[PDB]
Amino acid sequence: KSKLAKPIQDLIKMIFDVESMKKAMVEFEIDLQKMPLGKLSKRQIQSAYSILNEVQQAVSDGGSESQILDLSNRFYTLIPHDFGMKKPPLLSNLEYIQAKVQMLDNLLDIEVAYSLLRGGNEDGDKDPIDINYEKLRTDIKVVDKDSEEAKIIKQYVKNTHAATHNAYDLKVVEIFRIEREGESQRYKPFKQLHNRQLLWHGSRTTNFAGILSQGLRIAPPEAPVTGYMFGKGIYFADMVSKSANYCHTSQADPIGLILLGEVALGNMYELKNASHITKLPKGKHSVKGLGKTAPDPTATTTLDGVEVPLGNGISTGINDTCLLYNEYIVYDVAQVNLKYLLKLKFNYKT
Numbered sequence: 001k002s003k004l005a006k007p008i009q010d011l012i013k014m015i016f017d018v019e020s021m022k023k024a025m026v027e028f029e030i031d032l033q034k035m036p037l038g039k040l041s042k043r044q045i046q047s048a049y050s051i052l053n054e055v056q057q058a059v060s061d062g063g064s065e066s067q068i069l070d071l072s073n074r075f076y077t078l079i080p081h082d083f084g085m086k087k088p089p090l091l092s093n094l095e096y097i098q099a100k101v102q103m104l105d106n107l108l109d110i111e112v113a114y115s116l117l118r119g120g121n122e123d124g125d126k127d128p129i130d131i132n133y134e135k136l137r138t139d140i141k142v143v144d145k146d147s148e149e150a151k152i153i154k155q156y157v158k159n160t161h162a163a164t165h166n167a168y169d170l171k172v173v174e175i176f177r178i179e180r181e182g183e184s185q186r187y188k189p190f191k192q193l194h195n196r197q198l199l200w201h202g203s204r205t206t207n208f209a210g211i212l213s214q215g216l217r218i219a220p221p222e223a224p225v226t227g228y229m230f231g232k233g234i235y236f237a238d239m240v241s242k243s244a245n246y247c248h249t250s251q252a253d254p255i256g257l258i259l260l261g262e263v264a265l266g267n268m269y270e271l272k273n274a275s276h277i278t279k280l281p282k283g284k285h286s287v288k289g290l291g292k293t294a295p296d297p298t299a300t301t302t303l304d305g306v307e308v309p310l311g312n313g314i315s316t317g318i319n320d321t322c323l324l325y326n327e328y329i330v331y332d333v334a335q336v337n338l339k340y341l342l343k344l345k346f347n348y349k350t
């Protein structure tokens with residue numbers, strides 16, 4: 001049997017749940033009959049990104065419609081889709097292309113989860129749960145619900161829940177202290193930077209085996225820079241609300257996972273509108289999309305020397321901005337050090 005605490009056991013079962021992987025793929029409209037979980041390969045996903053990159057270029061620059069049709073056909077042949085009784089939409093709309101780039105970001109993590117799940121499981125002297133946990137190469141520990149650490153985090157969750165996102169409440173079911181192998185080490189150089197903050201990162205439960213084993217990562221070289229509002233970086237938020245939405249939970253599936261990572265922001269390059277950033281200006285370490293609301297700078301605390309913006313959602317003096325809430329982007333995978341993983345229960349208003 002498992003040596004791990006129950007909460008952790010329940011966490012492992014959840015992140016390695018095969019049915020959840022299929023549900024995700026079905027939602028992205030993949031054809032599970034022609035494209036089963038076992039057919040997914042990294043090479044396959046890379047090719048798909050390139051195709052999306054080319055089609056994106058042809059739509060922007062006014063390429064032949066014959067070009068766009070051929071690119072669509074190759075994309076749907078590479079990744080079989082099931083549109084039911086409707087005709088398959090062409091990759092000729094920039095919004096639809098962005099949706100498809102998002103889908104591939106997810107398939108990248110699902111592919112990792114499945115590969116690990118089918119990996120070295122022969123050992124009979126270990127419980128299945130224990131074997132998969134070790135595959136994550138991440139030391140996971142339960143944070144004592146009553147300790148100061150937990151109190152601060154519960155405060156961060158409660159206070160930063162936005163007004164417009166109050167279509168659901170949020171209950172912190174469990175808090176885990178996570179420490180990925182080799183991460184503290186690659187992050188070391190950035191402790192020299194100032195403006196290090198504890199920020200939020202939401203994602204589907206299906207991406208977590210990938211997130212824990214490989215860490216958060218920037219999109220590959222093949223992905224169009226256009227598929228992302230501020231370019232190919234790693235995104236974070238200061239309002240639990242903003243990130244929580246990326247968990248993709250529902251009335252039918254209410255438990256989501258969310259990360260709290262220490263992020264070395266340094267001098268932020270502040271923006272009010274989208275910009276497909278490739279190069280970061282000299283002297284800037286990150287990007288900050290400004291929002292109309294943000295935690296009250298008054299209430300900002302520290303936790304082990306890292307700033308925690310746990311203040312209440314106060315409106316900022318900026319009005320000429322497209323964003324409702326702040327977004328922080330780092331363009332170097334070493335600029336983040338994951339700290340906690342929270343098991344959240346989304347309570348929907350009905």
Ligand SMILES: COc1cccc(C(N)=O)c1
Pocket residue numbers: 200201202203235236237242243244246326327328
């Ligand atoms: C893509 O834009 C964002 C912006 C801010 C946070 C997140 C997230 N996944 O937690 C994503």
